[PDB]
Ligand binder design. Structure first.
Ligand SMILES: CO[C@@H]1O[C@H](CS[C@@H]2O[C@H](CO)[C@@H](O)[C@H](O)[C@H]2O)[C@@H](O)[C@H](O)[C@H]1O
Length: 603
């Protein structure tokens, strides 16, 4: 009697979309296109403005240390308000689960993407997507702003660690994250259609469209200076692979392509992504990305709304001034500046994703999934990934020396040292707990020092000293040392760095240690950094990138349980004066070329 077709789970998605769209008011439509921060959301706001989506931006959590159930109860509280609207359209909640569900205390933290590139193991990355989707659903969240498919062309960019590689082919291969997060697409699948398998999967997001990895001087907020040919040949291809794998959403770059702001680029967003690649999911802005269309940012927000929505963006990550956004867009539609056809297209795409993914059938969190958070199988996977990511750059000072690695687990006394040997937050890097990461024991994990203590024979005495002097080392009766140093956590706008040298004490500790005893240096970094001096001092040196919460991945290789297999996914420069300098360039003079990596055999 009271049958409503969009509420019928047995109906085809396109019929449900069209049935719902035909019923919606303009307020209901513009609400769907609006994404807000949890920080500004209340039940009344969500209901009264018919809100379509929420997010947690970096560090946006219900409280420090919050359990999986606390996150579920948060998300469900917001959902209950959404489901209480006239039409009962469930919100989608988005988060940056970019190396695990990394805002959440106790989530497994996987290596960052640059290290995943070093594994050259797309099936490993798919399995990471799988595990990540489980840990995201453990917290009640249904959408991950991942993968970042940037092709970072200059390691001075502060997000270079979010790129699998400077080589688009490796980036393309690691789009296997998508069917991990979302599920494998049907055999009959049409490229560009969105797909999510159901309540144990999440919607994914290929980001940031397009050429975010190309930006002049590394910088971003900035211009990506190259022609159609290098756009199409370097920066774009992985977006086609993402279409073929049913990526549900695409996020637009803050960047510009040849002086045109991506958030205002109709030719690329509508002409290419939608009309040429036949993308049928939704296009989301970046954080205040429409604001940044103008200079200064936010100085003509009316223009920002007109320009972005006419360019083809579907959902706007406001994320705070939702009343201004909705008011302005409403005015634009009432005035005929934005046609109803454009609103209807945006809403069609958002609804298409929501229906496809089963969000109308399972709008609420599954309490039984809470135990997927930080689950030990997932940590075992992260430990495998971390080990596979390690690139061995040196293993002996001369070709006649005994190879230092693998180290024996049985020795009378060994030294573990360095700023990075017992600091979980430094080993995770940015996008861990906080936006910019943090120092010290910020989540559940195993530092390098703890990993060493867990690996060695019970007779081996392990001494830790963060920054020992040369005399301490020479007097200590050590068999060897493991010294871990490197970069502090960062994101784009502390991490855009011109000198790329590691902070002190880092080199000075390696010199003091290695001057006294043979030493294996573990370099923790988001990118290649100035390395000759560290190499000169070290018997062995490993580029461990940002390996995440499972430090036993490092020791699994140091102690020979597995052989080193990682290969550089980026060029290692001799000097920052050379940059940009990528594989295949004409003037190509690397310290280590892309693909370089020494090996060991398991003992
Ligand atoms: C600096 O202010 C903080 O910015 C971060 C990153 S900006 C933008 O954020 C999106 C949603 O988190 C990410 O998917 C995207 O990759 C980033 O470019 C933001 O997360 C914080 O919320 C904001 O305080």
């Amino acid at each position: 009697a009271d049958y409503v077709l969009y509420k019928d789970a047995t109906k085809p998605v396109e019929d449900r979309v069209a049935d719902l769209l035909g019923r919606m008011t303009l307020a209901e439509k513009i609400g769907q296109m609006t994404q807000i921060e949890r920080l500004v959301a209340t039940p009344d706001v969500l209901r009264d403005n018919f809100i379509g989506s929420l997010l947690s931006g970096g560090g946006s959590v219900p409280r420090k240390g919050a359990t999986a159930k606390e996150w579920q109860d948060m998300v469900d509280g917001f959902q209950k308000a959404c489901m209480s609207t006239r039409l009962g359209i469930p919100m989608i909640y988005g988060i940056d689960a970019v190396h695990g569900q990394n805002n959440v205390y106790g989530a497994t933290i996987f290596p960052h993407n640059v290290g995943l590139g070093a594994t050259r193991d797309p099936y490993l990355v798919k399995r990471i997507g799988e595990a990540t989707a489980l840990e995201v659903r453990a917290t009640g969240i249904q959408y991950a702003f991942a993968p970042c498919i940037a092709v970072c062309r200059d390691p001075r960019w502060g997000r270079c660690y979010e790129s699998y590689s400077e080589d688009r082919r490796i980036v393309q291969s690691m789009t296997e994250l998508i069917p991990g997060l979302q599920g494998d697409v049907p055999k009959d699948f049409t490229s560009g259609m969105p797909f999510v398998a159901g309540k144990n999967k999440v919607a994914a997001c290929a980001k940031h469209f397009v050429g975010d990895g190309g930006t002049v001087d590394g910088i971003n907020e900035n211009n990506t200076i190259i022609n159609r040919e290098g756009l199409m040949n370097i920066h774009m291809p992985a977006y086609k692979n993402a279409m073929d794998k049913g990526v549900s959403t695409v996020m637009i770059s803050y960047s510009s392509w040849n002086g045109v702001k991506m958030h205002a680029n109709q030719d690329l967003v509508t002409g290419y992504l939608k009309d040429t690649l036949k993308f049928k999911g939704f296009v989301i802005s970046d954080w205040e990305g429409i604001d940044r269309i103008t200079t200064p940012a936010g100085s003509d927000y009316s223009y920002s709304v007109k320009a972005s929505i006419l360019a083809g963006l579907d959902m706007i990550m406001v994320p705070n001034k939702y009343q201004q956004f909705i008011s302005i867009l409403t005015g634009h539609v009432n005035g005929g500046v934005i046609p109803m056809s454009r609103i209807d297209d945006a809403v069609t795409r958002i609804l298409r994703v929501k229906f496809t993914m089963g969000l109308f059938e399972n709008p609420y969190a599954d309490p039984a999934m809470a135990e997927q958070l930080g689950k030990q199988e997932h940590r075992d996977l992260a430990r495998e990934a971390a080990r596979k990511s390690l690139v061995l750059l040196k293993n002996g000072k001369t070709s006649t020396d005994a190879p230092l690695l693998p180290l024996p687990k049985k020795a009378p006394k060994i030294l573990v040292a360095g700023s990075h040997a017992d600091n979980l937050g430094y080993q995770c890097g940015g996008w861990t707990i906080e936006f910019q990461g943090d120092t010290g024991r910020t989540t559940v994990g195993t530092t390098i020092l703890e990993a060493v203590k867990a690996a060695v024979d019970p007779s081996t005495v392990v001494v830790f000293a963060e920054n020992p002097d040369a005399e301490f080392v020479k007097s200590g009766g050590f068999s060897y040392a493991i010294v871990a140093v490197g970069e502090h956590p960062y994101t784009e706008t502390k991490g855009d760095n011109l000198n790329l040298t590691i902070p002190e004490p880092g080199l000075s500790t390696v010199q003091a240690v290695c001057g006294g005893v043979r030493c294996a240096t573990v370099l923790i970094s988001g990118r290649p950094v100035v390395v000759q001096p560290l190499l000169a001092a070290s018997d062995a040196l490993v580029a461990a990138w940002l390996p995440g919460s499972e430090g036993q991945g490092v020791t699994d290789a140091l102690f020979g349980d597995f052989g080193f297999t990682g290969r550089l996914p980026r060029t290692w420069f001799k000097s920052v004066d050379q940059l940009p300098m990528n594989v295949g360039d004409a003037h190509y003079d690397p310290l280590f070329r892309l693909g370089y990596g020494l090996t060991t055999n398991a003992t």
